[PDB]
Design a protein around this ligand. Structure first.
Ligand code: NAG
Ligand code: NAG
Ligand code: NAG
Ligand code: NAG
Ligand code: NAG
Ligand code: NAG
Ligand code: NAG
Ligand code: ZN
Lengths: 250, 587
């Protein structure tokens, strides 16, 4: 008969411009996580920015995410090699995915990697960016380690000095303008959409209409679709009125 | 476990060495492109840092047991890293040896005959003057200066190197050099040290008739040049070969012209008329390598590397080289002008580059050819393929019709034989003499006599005037006085033709092998790339197996290459005498 759309009323632009256009990105071994909630999210210009070397969305289609809701969003960002961007994906191994950043199998986000050879690289070497080479055990998904204790390979304890069979774990990236494609810096941003039983906060951008009673009509509440007769009181909670409404199959 | 200890150590080394080597190579490139002041100290500092780092890493790696490691690749890397070299000897002996090498190099660099230096006047004088007396005088003066000045230095160098090599569990310094062609641990592919002393004389006995006929034909042509100067049975003189040491006979092409009516193929004017901007040559070479099926060039290759000379204000080295600086940086340093020689050199350098791009995935210690010969054969076969009339007709510079008369084939094959087959006896004789001298079987008192009798026997060249024991002829050569191995050229000359025949047969090309082409044959490109990518992680026997299907070097494709020339020489020499006599002497 008719279709009604109802999303929570939010007029706050989502701060993707601050994370994507940050002045300095954190090193891969010690990355920074940004929390995003209570915003209207526009994933159009993000996808069609026409300057991203890789935009791969896992779990959900990259285009439908323009009209779905989640509880909140986590955005991670760092800098790696051009040839290691492949290891930022579920079910991959290596020296990055083992010791720095391992995504879990049930990933429900997107990965966006773009070249940054103009900013990070400089003549003589930019030794600011470091990556972890040795570690006793592989990282658990979404884990950060910052300790710089001397990794021990031999039997004799080196007592925290750089002795024989003991190594400094962190090794420095080197960047120059004349490197190859497989060695130039690449800035990587990982978006994870996490949802719980709590009401949704990030939605949009979509219009809304007035609620109706009776008059069996198609509807989508907070991104979930249904067909039936809405009766005042299987059932959904209004995202702008906080009233329980019952659904009856006509 | 020691296995994991070695793996971790190599994991750290790889990164440290990659960084330091990139720094050193970048400094060296910036010097070679810009030879100004303040660029020398930087090169020296980078090289000193790299050498000290290598020595310290060698000392650290010396602790780990070698026989315990068994992964056959970690073991290879550790064995390559464990090379004491000159560190075994005392500091004073090492300093004296370095002084001897430096003063020999300085004496070779600074030589005057009177004024007259070696480059470039003396070589040009010997090339075209074609006068008996003055050429003899120049040759004798150069010998009586250089050999006289480097006798005791060479003896001390011999004894010091021999004892130093004996200190490293090797038999002699010659054995230390021969140890390059060593593989162990792989059954069915092992190659012993002493097997290289064979497979050289044995293979040379196979190529004797062709060299004999060529020598007789050249002798007859020299008889035409100098009527009453050469005996019909006597050997050639040393100063009539057209070169200082007789290593190449190419300068004798003008005298030994098979047919002067038909000129050689020259398309320099074709490139001049169409105004090739010296950049389209590299585009054409890249297109050739793409048509074969090999990867396209890196984007940074076209911008970082230099092809035109920087100008008159700034002077730079024009010696053609292909640099692989690591970290994905490949460059080519070559001053290019319009000439066929520049075209073939561009093809050779891009062959080097396409070899370098293939094994970039290997670890740092294994980024080299399987042996010391595989790196030049791959470069030379590209020039061999691009010199054929087929590919020259493929591009528009050559006329679509031409004549392809057999005289052209005979002339081309004769000219190519004067350079390729005229250098094997000399290289073999020089290396054999040096091996026997280092081994000690030849005493001090019989150096020059043995050298000249071997020259009479194998190469068939007789000195103009006798020399006493105080002379030293071998030390005049560049490689001898600068401590370089000279067996690489002999093996490369055979691997080149082995690879060419294998690629042509895999490309189902019908007809003579000397007019074969590899372009537009993706199967041949794939077969060659399957061996190029290997690097030094496999024994050179198995790497050779991936191309030709044989586990050892062979001279048969080389003989088949010159088959029309061999038949023509047989027919032309059926009348003249065949052989040489050592009894006759010019004096
Ligand atoms: C980042 O900066 C560019 C250039 O100023 C701008 O076009 C873009 O809208 C900014 N934000 C994002 C998310 O790219
Ligand atoms: C947004 O929705 C809430 C629902 O609780 C309402 O109270 C508020 O007035 C709305 N804001 C508007 C209409 O600007
Ligand atoms: C070569 O080095 C000198 C030393 O300062 C420098 O002035 C010059 O610009 C360099 N050449 C080029 C082409 O940059
Ligand atoms: C070590 O052994 C493994 C297992 O066979 C092999 O894959 C690897 O190539 C060997 N070499 C190195 C350097 O890891
Ligand atoms: C280098 O010299 C040390 C000194 O003891 C020795 O242990 C080691 O085996 C030598 N290595 C080689 C490759 O000669
Ligand atoms: C070329 O072929 C012609 C015709 O058979 C022959 O007369 C001539 O001798 C040949 N020339 C050479 C150099 O073989
Ligand atoms: C190889 O094929 C190309 C077609 O792209 C052609 O232009 C070229 O002339 C061919 N090469 C030869 C040697 O015929
Ligand atoms: Zn070369």
């Amino acid at each position: 008969t008719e279709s009604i759309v109802r999303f929570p009323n939010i007029t706050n632009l989502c701060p993707f411009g601050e994370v994507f256009n940050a002045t300095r990105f954190a090193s891969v071994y010690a990355w920074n996580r940004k929390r995003i909630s209570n915003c209207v999210a526009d994933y159009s210009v993000l996808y069609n920015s026409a300057s991203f070397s890789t935009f791969k969305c896992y779990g959900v289609s990259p285009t439908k995410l323009n009209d779905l809701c989640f509880t909140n969003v986590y955005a991670d960002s760092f800098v790696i090699r051009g040839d290691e961007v492949r290891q930022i994906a579920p079910g991959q191994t290596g020296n990055i995915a083992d010791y720095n950043y391992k995504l879990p199998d049930d990933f429900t986000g997107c990965v966006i990697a773009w070249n940054s050879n103009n900013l990070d690289s400089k003549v003589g070497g930019n030794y600011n960016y470091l990556y972890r080479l040795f570690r006793k055990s592989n990282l658990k998904p979404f884990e950060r380690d910052i300790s710089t204790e001397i990794y021990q390979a031999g039997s004799t304890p080196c007592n925290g000095v750089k002795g024989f069979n003991c190594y400094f774990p962190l090794q420095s990236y080197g960047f120059q303008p004349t490197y190859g494609v497989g060695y130039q810096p690449y800035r990587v941003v990982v978006l994870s959409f996490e949802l719980l039983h709590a009401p949704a906060t990030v939605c949009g951008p979509k219009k809304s209409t007035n609620l109706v009673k009776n008059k069996c009509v198609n509807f989508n509440f907070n991104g979930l679709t249904g067909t039936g007769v809405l009766t005042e009181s299987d059932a959904v909670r209004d995202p702008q009125t906080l009233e329980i409404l019952d659904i009856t199959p006509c | 476990t020691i296995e994991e200890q070695a793996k971790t150590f190599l994991d750290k080394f790889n990164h440290e060495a990659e960084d330091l080597f990139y720094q050193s190579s970048l400094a060296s490139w910036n010097y070679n492109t810009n030879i100004t002041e303040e660029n020398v100290q930087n090169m020296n500092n980078a090289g000193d840092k790299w050498s000290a780092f290598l020595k310290e890493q060698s000392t650290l790696a010396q602790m780990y047991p070698l026989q315990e490691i068994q992964n056959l690749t970690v073991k290879l890397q550790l064995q390559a890293l464990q090379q004491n070299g000159s560190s075994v000897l005392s500091e004073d002996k090492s300093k004296r040896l370095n002084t001897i090498l430096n003063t020999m190099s300085t004496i070779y660099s600074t030589g005057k005959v009177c004024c007259l230096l070696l480059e470039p006047g003396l070589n040009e004088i010997m090339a075209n003057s074609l006068d008996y007396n003055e050429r003899l005088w120049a040759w004798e003066s150069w010998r009586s200066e250089v050999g006289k000045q480097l006798r005791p230095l060479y003896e001390e160098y011999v004894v010091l190197k021999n004892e130093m090599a004996r200190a490293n569990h090797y038999e002699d310094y010659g054995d230390y050099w021969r140890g390059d062609y060593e593989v162990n641990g792989v059954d069915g592919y092992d190659y012993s040290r002493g097997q290289l002393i064979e497979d050289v004389e044995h293979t040379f006995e196979e190529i004797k008739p062709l060299y004999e006929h060529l020598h007789a034909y050249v002798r007859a042509k020299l008889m035409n040049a100098y009527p009453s100067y050469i005996s019909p049975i006597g050997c050639l003189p040393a100063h009539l070969l057209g070169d200082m040491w007789g290593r190449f006979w190419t300068n004798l092409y003008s005298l030994t012209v098979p047919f002067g009516q038909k000129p050689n193929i020259d398309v320099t004017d074709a490139m001049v008329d169409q105004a090739w901007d010296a950049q389209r040559i590299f585009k054409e070479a890249e297109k050739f390598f793409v048509s074969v099926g090999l990867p396209n060039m890196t984007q940074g290759f076209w911008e970082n590397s230099m092809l035109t000379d920087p100008g008159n204000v700034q002077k730079a080295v024009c010696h053609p080289t292909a640099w692989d600086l690591g970290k994905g940086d490949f460059r080519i340093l070559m001053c290019t002008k319009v000439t066929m020689d520049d075209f073939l050199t561009a093809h050779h350098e891009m062959g080097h580059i396409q070899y370098d791009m293939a094994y970039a995935a290997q670890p740092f210690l294994l980024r080299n050819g399987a042996n010391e010969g595989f790196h030049e054969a791959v470069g030379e076969i590209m020039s061999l393929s691009a010199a054929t009339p087929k590919h020259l007709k493929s591009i528009g510079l050559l006329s679509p019709d031409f004549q392809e008369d057999n005289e052209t084939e005979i002339n081309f094959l004769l000219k190519q034989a004067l350079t390729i087959v005229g250098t094997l006896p000399f290289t073999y004789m020089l290396e054999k003499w040096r091996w026997m001298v280092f081994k000690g079987e030849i005493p001090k008192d019989q150096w020059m006599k043995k050298w000249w009798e071997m020259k009479r026997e194998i190469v068939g060249v007789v000195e103009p005037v006798p020399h006493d024991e105080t002379y030293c002829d071998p030390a005049s050569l560049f490689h001898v006085s600068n401590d370089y191995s000279f067996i690489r050229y002999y093996t490369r000359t055979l691997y080149q033709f082995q690879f060419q025949e294998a690629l042509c047969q895999a490309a189902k090309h019908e007809g003579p092998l000397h007019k074969c082409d590899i372009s537009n044959s993706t199967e041949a490109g794939q077969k060659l790339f399957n061996m190029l990518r290997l690097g030094k992680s496999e024994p050179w026997t198995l790497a050779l197996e991936n191309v030709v299907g044989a586990k050892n070097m062979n001279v048969r494709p080389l003989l088949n290459y010159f088959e029309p020339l061999f038949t023509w020489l047989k027919d032309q020499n059926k009348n003249s005498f065949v052989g040489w006599s050592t009894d006759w002497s010019p004096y």
